[PDB]
Design a protein around this ligand. Structure first.
Ligand SMILES: Nc1nc2c(ncn2[C@@H]2O[C@H](COP(=O)(O)OP(=O)(O)O)[C@@H](O)[C@H]2O)c(=O)[nH]1
Ligand SMILES: [Mg+2]
Length: 176
């Protein structure tokens, strides 16, 4: 659904384990802010951003999938029609990285095959607590057909780069 004034509208979703930084990543990208305190989760919602790429004005409708679910019945409805995903883990939390394949399986189950994915090792500022080497993220991203970046919502490292790369690969696939 393209709004007047835009050339495209791409739905993007942030997915991954609880506490990897999804809500923070979206808050940094959309509002260029960070909250150093616990914020309550009250449900799934989106924020918008405009990107100018490939000579077009692109509206991004970017969905935060909110908290963990007991029954994965609500988040997964929003995967339908998504042009892209940020599949996020925390470089300081091994379990969040071990979960990547499960999230990737969900992408394939609930979204069309041409949905694009960037694997994001968030919290790259936490080098003192790193447990997931970037090379391990890159290897898995290559295995699964995803782009890859390390980033930090907290320090505003590679947040723009992640979204812009995702928009680029979406545009490339669209022109196949
Ligand atoms: N050190 C660090 N902490 C972060 C970063 N991004 C988010 N956090 C923190 O990680 C916790 C979980 O973030 P949140 O965005 O709520 O994660 P979500 O459960 O995936 O939505 C919060 O305490 C955030 O402040 C980051 O880039 N670096
Ligand atoms: Mg959240």
């Amino acid at each position: 659904l393209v709004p007047r004034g835009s050339d495209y509208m791409f739905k993007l979703l942030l997915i991954g384990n609880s506490s990897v930084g999804k809500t923070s990543f979206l808050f940094r990208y959309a509002d260029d802010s960070f909250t150093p305190a616990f914020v309550s989760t009250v449900g799934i919602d989106f924020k918008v951003k405009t990107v100018y790429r490939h000579d077009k004005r692109i509206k991004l409708q970017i969905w935060d999938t909110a908290g963990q679910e007991r029954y994965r019945t609500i988040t997964t409805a929003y995967y339908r029609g998504a042009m892209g995903f940020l599949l996020m883990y925390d470089i300081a939390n091994q379990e969040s990285f071990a979960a990547v394949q499960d999230w990737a399986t969900q992408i394939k189950t609930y979204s069309w095959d041409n949905a694009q994915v960037i694997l994001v090792g968030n919290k790259c500022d936490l080098e003192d607590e790193r447990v997931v080497p970037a090379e391990d993220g890159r290897r898995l991203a290559d295995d699964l057909g995803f782009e890859f970046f390390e980033a930090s919502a907290k320090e505003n490292i590679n947040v723009k780069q992640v979204f812009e790369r995702l928009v680029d690969v979406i545009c490339e696939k669209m022109n196949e």
